[PDB]
Curated annotation (Swiss-Prot):
Keywords: ATP-binding, DNA damage, DNA recombination, DNA-binding, Nucleotide-binding. Belongs to the eukaryotic RecA-like protein family. This is DNA repair and recombination protein RadA. GO terms for biological process: DNA recombination; DNA repair.
Length: 217
């Protein structure tokens, strides 16, 4: 029942989030294409695996890809640049591609089954990534008349994500193309993260960089 924390790689971004990404909660990052959402997702996929003193929870990660954003070659560079074995870091990230919105919900029943199997092991799942959470729902429910249903399907998927985060004590990290964090391009390849409407965290901004290590100050 202790709320775990995952470092994002950047200490200024971790400060804004009150210590990092929370287990038993969903953290949403939104912004335009190229604002760093997937780089943050890839950095977290590595960070989670690290011991607490280094910013992780000694866990494994699951990655649900909706629009082919997963880059194992990028995860290998981040693992290498942080002094880890890239093939071992890769082995600890379960990847699954969602082809449609209904397949996306079905993937959560598979994540649930996988989480149970790895629960007693020395490396339980501590992170679930959903890259471009809303892309399939917007593709399939177009126009004024399918707005009610899209919102209904989306709310249902969010209810499911909340249940998994609470019963397995995992962080859920979701990305959303343009807890909520707005990402934006800053000056000189810098990125600005702005925290919006957090109940117990003040609004503020955090500037960070995209490097060979993924995300850092």
């Amino acid at each position: 029942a202790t709320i775990g924390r995952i470092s994002t790689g950047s200490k200024s971004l971790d400060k804004l989030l009150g210590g990092g990404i929370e287990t038993q909660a969903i953290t949403e990052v939104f912004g335009e294409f190229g604002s760093g959402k997937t780089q943050l997702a890839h950095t977290l996929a590595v960070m989670v695996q690290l011991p607490p003193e280094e910013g992780g929870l000694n866990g494994s990660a699951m990655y649900i890809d909706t629009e082919n954003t997963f880059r194992p070659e990028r995860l290998r560079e981040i693992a290498q640049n942080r002094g880890l074995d890239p093939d071992e870091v890769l082995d600890n990230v379960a990847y699954a591609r969602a082809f449609n919105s209904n397949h996306q919900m079905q993937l959560l029943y598979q994540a649930s089954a996988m989480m149970v199997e790895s629960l007693n092991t020395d490396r339980p799942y501590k992170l679930l990534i959903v890259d471009s959470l809303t892309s399939h729902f917007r593709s399939e429910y177009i126009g004024r008349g399918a707005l009610a249903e899209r919102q209904q399907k989306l709310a249902r998927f969010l209810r499911m994500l909340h249940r998994l985060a609470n019963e397995f004590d995992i962080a859920v990290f979701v990305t959303n193309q343009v807890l909520r964090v707005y990402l934006r391009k800053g000056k000189g390849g810098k990125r600005i993260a702005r925290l919006i409407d957090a109940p117990h965290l003040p609004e503020g901004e955090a500037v960070f960089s995209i490097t060979e290590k993924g995300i850092e100050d």
